[PDB]
Every structure is written in structure tokens, then in C-alpha cells.
Design a protein around this ligand. Sequence first.
Ligand code: GDP
Ligand code: GDP
Lengths: 84, 446, 444, 254
Amino acid sequence: VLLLNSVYEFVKVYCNLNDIGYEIFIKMNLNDHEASNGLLGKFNTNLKEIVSQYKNFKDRLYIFRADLKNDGDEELFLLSKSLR
Amino acid sequence: MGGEIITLQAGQCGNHVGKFLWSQLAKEHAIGTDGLSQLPDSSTERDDDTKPFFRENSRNKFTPRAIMMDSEPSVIADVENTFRGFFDPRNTWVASDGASAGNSWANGYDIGTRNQDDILNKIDKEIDSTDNFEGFQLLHSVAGGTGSGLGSNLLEALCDRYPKKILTTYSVFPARSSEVVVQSYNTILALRRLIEDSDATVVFDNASLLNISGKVFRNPNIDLQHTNQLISTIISSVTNSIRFPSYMYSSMSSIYSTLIPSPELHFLSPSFTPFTSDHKGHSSYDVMLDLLDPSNSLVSTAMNNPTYFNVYNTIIGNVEPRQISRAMTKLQQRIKFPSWSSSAMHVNIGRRSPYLPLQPNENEVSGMMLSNMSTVVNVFENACNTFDKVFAKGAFLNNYNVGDLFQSMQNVQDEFAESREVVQSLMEDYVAAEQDSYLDDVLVDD
Amino acid sequence: GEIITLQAGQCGNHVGKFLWSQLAKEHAIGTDGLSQLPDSSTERDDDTKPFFRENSRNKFTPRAIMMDSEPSVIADVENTFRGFFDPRNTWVASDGASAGNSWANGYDIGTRNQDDILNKIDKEIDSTDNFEGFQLLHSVAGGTGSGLGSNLLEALCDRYPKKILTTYSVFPARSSEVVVQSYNTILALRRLIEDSDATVVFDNASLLNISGKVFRNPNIDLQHTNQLISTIISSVTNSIRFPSYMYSSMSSIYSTLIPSPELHFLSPSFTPFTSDHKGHSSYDVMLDLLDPSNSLVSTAMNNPTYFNVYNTIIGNVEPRQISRAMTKLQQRIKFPSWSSSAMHVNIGRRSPYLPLQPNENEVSGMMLSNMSTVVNVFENACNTFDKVFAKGAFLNNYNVGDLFQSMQNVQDEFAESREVVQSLMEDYVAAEQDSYLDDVLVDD
Amino acid sequence: EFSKKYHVLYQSNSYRGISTNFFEIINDQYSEIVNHTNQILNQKFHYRDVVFALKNILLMGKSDFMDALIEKANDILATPSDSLPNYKLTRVLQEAVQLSSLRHLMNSPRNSSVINGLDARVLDLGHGSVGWDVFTLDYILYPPLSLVLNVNRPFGRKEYLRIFNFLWRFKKNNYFYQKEMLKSNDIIRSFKKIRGYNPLIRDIINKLSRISILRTQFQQFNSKMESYYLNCIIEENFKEMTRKLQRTENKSQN
Ligand SMILES: Nc1nc2c(ncn2[C@@H]2O[C@H](COP(=O)(O)OP(=O)(O)O)[C@@H](O)[C@H]2O)c(=O)[nH]1
Ligand SMILES: Nc1nc2c(ncn2[C@@H]2O[C@H](COP(=O)(O)OP(=O)(O)O)[C@@H](O)[C@H]2O)c(=O)[nH]1
């Protein structure tokens, strides 16, 4: 569930970047050398959040995979390996 | 999500493929060659969904969601006659009478440009009929000139006119290393447009398709018109879940969301295990292993230390998951993925149509699949080598102004140069992706 | 293990006619390819699959490729076996008849048609899952016969390097035709020696020495005596067709028959039998089999060296009789000082559908052996060859295709073929000596 | 009529006390009533069809339907549970049917009565929750089927609703990635105009292309996990249960 909750949150942050990227492109349609660096700042800021979340997610996912694998039952070994 | 799909045939190649597609599709849905349901109305329950491919009217006639374009009325007419009563004649379009060859890409591009209004009006008329439209199936067949030219111009018009609709292109490369003197023209310019505008594409090799058709349908009488059945069935494998849905995909969007890690690298390489179509019934275990075997590839890719990327298949038939998981484990050991990647491998449901002939499920070896691999680049390179010589020398560069003003406006050098950068970037991106450090620009951007 | 029969030349196609006729009788299948049995009993207690592509339909399609230059022999067989054979597996060298009786001609037509021939072979392999091997039926000195066999062998030994292609070689009695026939024999034999799997020799002289006593004389004809050939072939595969529990594979069969990588040409014998069988004991059949009078190869040796001796007795065999026969046979076989004499005896089955079976309280059987004298079947051809192809018309004017790119490819192909045959003979002889292994096993 | 026949048969053997013959009547009665019952269940109550429908819908065996519901309900799903236009869901369900293969039941005799049992419910997860969290999609059964089938009984374990929510979480996330990936594609697409803008673009695009890859990491996670349950646990147990329920079909020659 926590991994599922994380992916829900990942979409929201990706969406925030998509909207920032959209506006950066709109601003260039109007002013080619503007598109305020503040937007690039926000873009990069939300990317830092994705990356932080990405890594945190991956570590939790690893633990989840490891727990499936070492609990016993070939199905969990197969599932865990398939998540790598 | 899924929605209706419109097939667009830009030339004879696609229009011939259409015989194979509409026959096989109608076959699977119990639709006759006259467009009518083949089922008696004594049984009305159905569990398929023909809506995305056919309009079903009050006479239970199924009208294909397709528009056929050509410069030669005969190929479309052949289809209309073969399937008389199946197709709506208003979806037939033909370019003003004329002819071109080699430079036919330029000519294609011109007939597209000159008639975008007429072709787009036909496309909008079909789309306007329904609400939930989701994408197009484009038969581009890059080797053809007017086919590719028209397809290139229509692709540009459609990707911006319909930005929300997924454009999937089916394109087969030339079987001849000598015709490339002009087919490399068609290829560099057509490939530019595919790279810039398409959302997805499947790349095929006529040399491999012809060889396989002859090997599987064991017979020396090898033809493009025999081979097109393989194309029809790779398409039917892909749409299996849409037409005969279950719970796994049933959407172009869904599969691409899982199968294409980057819109930059959306050129997929298909393969198959033996199937019947319009004794080797091996276990799904073996099917999976056989599907990544180089001998089953519809693209000659060499497969020398195969260059990984996202793998997806369908096993057609009712098969047991334990075999699937065992085979998948073995496949995971056989095919590598970059460490930056998710190393995803997926298997679809493969449900068979209820209107097909009976066979034991333990013998359902059949299936066709695609891999996202950099082993597509080697195909692009054979053109590339051919076109890095004719444009460099200027061979035929003085013979391409076939109505599109290629030479009239001296776009000759610019079309090559811009297209050349675009095709090189695709190849470079496929290759850059081969390294573990590919994502460092975002993941170690501390 | 699925087996595909290759019927090459008219001899190969005539022999196949007899073989398939016996198989239809053994497995009650009609000439139309249908089971002759009621379906009220669905268990057949046999397995036709290795020889027939039993269909989902009541159809048993012989796993065979019918190959000739003269379509009429195949038609004679297909026209008998009216539904039994699949005509898509029939190849005829329609692009010119063989230019006379020269293996080279058969080779040249097979060579041009090699891909088509192989395509038919694979169309049939596609109907076999566990493909194991082939059975080639052919004359040794026929143009189309030995030439086609030479082409088939070269094509298959490389295309299917792990499959078993055995040979059923039919040898004409030596006559004046030998001025051509000995090279057809010798050059096609070179190909067999180098590429073929275990081969069995059928000497037409012996078919006649026997048929003059067991066939309805005057018709003791070699194309009539194909029943004797068929009897041996069907006897060999009886352990496959109505399997028991000892030998159920060709590879198992040859495990005790082939002592080295050398191709061995084996000499069959058989007694007594019924065809269109009342022996007294297995004791007597086994003893009777160790006698040239029951042999299909006129080796005619009073004291040949035997290696690799095997026999199969089919019927109500008493093990005591078998044991007594082995006891005396053990004392009267010539074999080398370096190998203990191991006779292999297998017991087979009568078909559940054999019309004779209900009244069989008698036994019969087959013996196969590796004889140092089996090569006597090639002696007259060799002596002829040495005198004729040293320099006669017979060397060059009968050659077509690659054999006659130049006279050099004739002069050396013939001399080399003779040498390959000479080496074969020398090794059968070397094996007769104690030194064969005394210079091996104590060399340390 | 049935009872009268058996009444007579038991009267006929009443003099026997039991004496086996009684048992013999029962064995016949047993067979007759059970087989009659099953014919009814699948003739009038469409029992197997109901079973499949429940699996297809509540256990989400049909993909088109579930996506059809989400698109139709996107505003509902985004809107707080606190003030939902719950009546809109009647309209959503009707459309989700028309938008999916389920319409084949809706438009046919013998089948419309099955499809008509589907009915949405809202879970009280607290203030601030939204339709995405509280929509549970139930199905209503009446006896005679509610007496046969396992249903979300008010005093039971609510097996289906709990399972729905589990599967629902996967669908929510899958929905969102597809929606979001298209938004991404819409923007990454504007890579032509760049010829007059490259100095401020090359970096955002290179990051966006790599971001699509990162997005795919989550999509494959959800696709793999959701698929695992459906094609390993649900389908396998389902196929086994229908095999048991299909024994009356004499499906096996064995
Ligand atoms: N695979 C396939 N290729 C075809 C077919 N028909 C034509 N071609 C291709 O056509 C190419 C040459 O150009 P073509 O499309 O025929 O002429 P166009 O009218 O200008 O588009 C060759 O490379 C062929 O591969 C077909 O039905 N199947
Ligand atoms: N035992 C036996 N010998 C045969 C048969 N048919 C022909 N022969 C021998 O075959 C030898 C040459 O090969 P053949 O197939 O007959 O002629 P080809 O078709 O021109 O090659 C001749 O010397 C014949 O003695 C047959 O069916 N059985």
C-alpha cells in the first residue's frame, strides 16, 4: 500500500512538472528568451522532489522484494525477481 | 483507457496489407467478407468488442474504421471487390493521376500536401462519428515512395491536428540493397517525419519477413503478398486485448505506458512462434523462450549480444502461469537490461476468439511479440549508409522535385541535412541508452 | 523416434512397396491409409506413429519421401496405396531423365533438385516431433538409385548432423554391366562409407539363392524378393512397432553393433517365415541362424570372424531353449582374442492383428552380424573397377555434372573411391587380428 | 407435480419401512431435484452468467468497463466525498455499460436482468476524502441467488468490497499514469519550435526525456503487481471454481 501511495504521489509531482513545462513553452511562444528562470527553478525543484521520492521508493521497493524473496515459497521468489 | 482506432493506408503496400488485416480481423470476429455478422441470430451473446474496428449498423453490417489512400485506384478497388459489401467506398481516396518512382517519396509528400484538405476531411468525417476515439494505425511501409511521402505529410498533419490521439506506425524496410539508391531518399525523409511525429512504431524488414513466411509456411513460393499475412497477425496479436479484452491491457495507451520508456525510443522489433492464420504446439514455457530467438525475428537484427530494452509478449491460448513464470525467470537470465532501466518484461492474456476453430489448449504455442531494443538501429544504418553516399555525391538530387518544390525552392540540401540530424539522433539515443549512466543527468543531479 | 523412409530409384520405390505392404499388414491399416480395425476397441497395443502420421482422421500417412527420375514406379506404388501415401512427398526429376545408368547422373539430377528434395523431406519432418532418423532404400549401382542416394546422403549428413540415416543397400549379382555398375557402386559406396549410418547389405545373388527355394518359381524375381528385404526391415523395426521393454530405439540397437566410428555393413539372416513359419523351437532357430544358408549376403565363408552378433526371436519363446542355444553358439563363433563374445538376443512380439497370430505356437527370427567377410559383396565390383576404370571409356564418358568438370575429377574421384573401399576392406581384416587391440590396450 | 409423484412413490414403499427401496427413491429424487435446480439456476437466474459478471466487474476481470467508469466519473472521483453528486453515478454506470462489452447484456433478453444488479456505494472514509477513495462499486443480489452466492452480506466479511478496494488502488494509479504520460507527450511533442529557442530548451527536454523513463518505473511496478494478482491468484482460483461449477456441463470425457 505504501508503494501504491507513493506512485499516486509520483503522479502529482510529475503533473506539477508537466504544468511547469507547459507554461515555460507558452512563455517562449510569447517571449523567446524569457520564460523566467524562476520557472526553471521550480521545474528543477520539483524534479529534485521526484528524484528524492524515486530513490526512497526504490529502497522501499527493494525491501519489499527482499521480503518476498526470503520468506519462502517459489511464487515469492519468482515475483521478487520479476520486479527487478 | 482504450477507444476507437482508425487505420490509414498510405499506398499499395498498406492497401494490400489491408486484405490480410481485414480478412483476419473479420475472421476472428465472425464478420464475413460482405461485412455482415457470420453468426446466426439465434445466439446474440458476444463477449468481444468490434466497435473500435467496425461501425455496427442495424443490419449487423460492420463498416471498417479505415481510410485507404493511393495514387493507384486498383489496389483499393481490389480490396473493395474482394470484400464487396464490407468497405464504405467513401473512405477511398486517390491522388490525381500520375506516376513517380524513387522520387516517389517527394511525389507522395506533394500529393499529401496538395490534398491534405481532402484526406483530412475524410479522416475527420470518420472521427466525428464517435466520441471515444483513441489513435490511429498507420501503414506507412517506409520502403515505398508515395506510400512514405504521403504518410510523411499526413503524419505531420495528424500529429498536430489530433495531438491527443496516439499514432502507431507499421513500417517495413526494403529487401534490396541496390534499390536503396532511391529508397534511402525515401527513408531518410520519411524516417525524419516518423521520428519527430509518431508516438509508436513497429519496424519490419522485408528480407526477414519474406524469409520467415517461406520457412514457416514451408514453401519456396515466397511473396510480399504471402508475407503480408505475418503483418496482419502481428497486428492482430497486438490488438488481441482490445478486440478480445480481459483485464491486462486493452489499450494502446496502456501498453505504451508500460512498453515505451521514452517517446524518443518507440521503434519496436517483432517476432513469433508458429501460428495458424488465414504439431509444433509446444508449451507456453517454450513459446516464451522461442519468442526471443533471433530466427523468429521479423527484422534482421543479427542479435549479436542483443542490445536489451523493455520486453512484451502475448501467448495466445489458455496456458498455465507456472510455466510462464518459469520461462520468464529463464528469459530474465538470457536477456539483459541496463541497470538504469526497470528491466521490465511483460506477458499479455492471449485469449482466443470464441469464433475460431477448436484446438487443444496445451498445444497453444502460438504468439507474436515485440521488444524495445536498440537492435533496430542496424536497420536504420543500412539505409543511412546508402543515403550518406547519394546525397553526399548528389546522385538523384536533381531528380526529386516531383511537385513538392523540393528542387524548386532548393530545399534539397536542407531536407537532407535536417532529416539526417534527426535520424542520427534517434540512433544515438538508442545507443546512449545502452549505458548504465544514461539517467545520471537526472538521478545524480545532486 | 520418428522415422522417414527414403525411396530412391526404382529399386528403392519397389522395395518400399513391399515394405509398406508388410507394414499395412502388421498394423492393420488398409491401402487407403485407414485403420482396418473396429473402433469399438480404441487401444491398439502398438504404435504406428513412428512410421505413420496417424491423423486425427482415420488415416495413417506413411512417413516417406518417394523419389525417382521415372514417375511410373512411384505411381505404381501410389496407385496401389490409394490414399495411404501423401503425394506431396513425391519428387521426380522431371528436368531431364538420367543420362544412362551412372551414379553421376542420379547425383546431377538430385543436385539440381537438392533443395526441392530437402523441402519435401522437411515437409515430412514438420509432421514429426521427435524426429530421429531415416531409412534409405536403394540399389547400389543404379544411376538414379545410387546417384540419388549419393545426393541425399550428402545433403542430409550435413543438414541433420545429429539424426540417424541408415542405409538399405541392394546389390546386383555381378554381371557384364559391372563395367559401369562397379563405379556406380564404388563411387556411391565412397559416399556411403564416408557419410552413411549403419548399413545393411542385401545381395541379389542370395535373394535368388533363397528365392529359388522359397518363392513360387519361376517368379523368384528380384522385385518379387523384395518381400525378403521387407521381412528383414520389418523384423528390425518390430521392436519399435510392437515394442517390448528391452530395445525401443535405433541408438540402443547400434550400441552393441557398432564397435568403432567405422561404418559397418551388416549381414542379415532369417528363418523360417510366412508370406504370400512353423519352426519347431527357438533353440533351433537360433542355431539355424548361425549358418550362411539363411543369409542374404553371399559371403560364403566357412570361418568368418564375427563381431557384434545380434538376433531377435519373435513368438512363444522358451528361455531355456535360448539358453541352450547360446551355450553351444558361445563355443562355435570365431571372434578376436581381445573381445569377449557377447551375443545379444532380443525377444519381440507378433502383431495383435497378425492373421497368423491365433495359431502361432511356433517361433521364428532374424540374425544380424558384423562379418569380416561382409565385404565379399564388393569383391567382383572392385576387381572390375581396378581393371576398367584404370583407363577405360567407363571412366570418363559416363560422367556428368561435377564429376566431369574435367577428366581430373574423374581420374581422381574414381581412384579415391576405390581407395576408400580398399580401406574399408583393410579395416574389416585388421579387426580379424589380435593385434588390432594388442597394439592398443597394452600400449602404456 | 414433483411432490405428488414422490408422495406416491413413498406411499408405495411405506409398507416397507425403509428396506433399501426407500433409499432408492431418494437417490432418484436427489438427482432429479438437483438437476432441475441447476437448470433453473442457469435458465432463469442465469447463475453462471451472474458469476462471471461478478468476476468481470467486482473482481475487475474486464478492463474496458473499469476504464469506462473512471473517465465518466473523473469529476466525481476528484470531488470530496463530503458533497458528491451521487446520482451522477447512476448516469456513470449506465454509460460505463454502453462504453464497454457489457452493453451486450444490456441489450439482450436473458441478460439484462444480470447487468441491472450493479449498484455503486460510498464508503465513509472521513471528511476531506474524495470519490477516488470512497467509491466502492457494489452489486445487489436477491434470493434465490443471494441464498446461493457469497455476497457482501451486512453482517458478513464484505469480501468483495475489500477486494475491490485493493484492485481499485491499482486502477487509480494506472489511470493516473496514463493520463499523466499523455500530458507529458503533449509537451515533449513541442520539440520543433526549438529551432528558435534551443538555448533555454535543450536542458529541459533532456531532463523530460529522462523523466519519462522515471515515470515508466512506476508504471511497470503497477502493471507487474496488478497483473501478478490477477493472473496468478484470481484467475487461477477462478478458473478452478468455474471448473467445479462447470462439472454439470459434462465438460470432461475423463
Ligand atoms: N511488405 C510489403 N511490401 C510491399 C507491398 N507492396 C509493395 N511493397 C513495397 O513497395 C516498395 C516500392 O514502392 P511502392 O510502395 O510499391 O510504390 P508507391 O506507389 O510509390 O508507394 C518495395 O520496397 C516493396 O517492399 C506489400 O503488399 N507488402
Ligand atoms: N532386389 C531388388 N533389386 C532390384 C529392384 N529393382 C531393380 N533392381 C536392381 O537395381 C539395379 C540398378 O538400380 P535401379 O533402381 O534398378 O535402376 P535405376 O532406377 O536406373 O537407378 C539393377 O541391377 C537391378 O538388378 C528391386 O525392387 N529389388
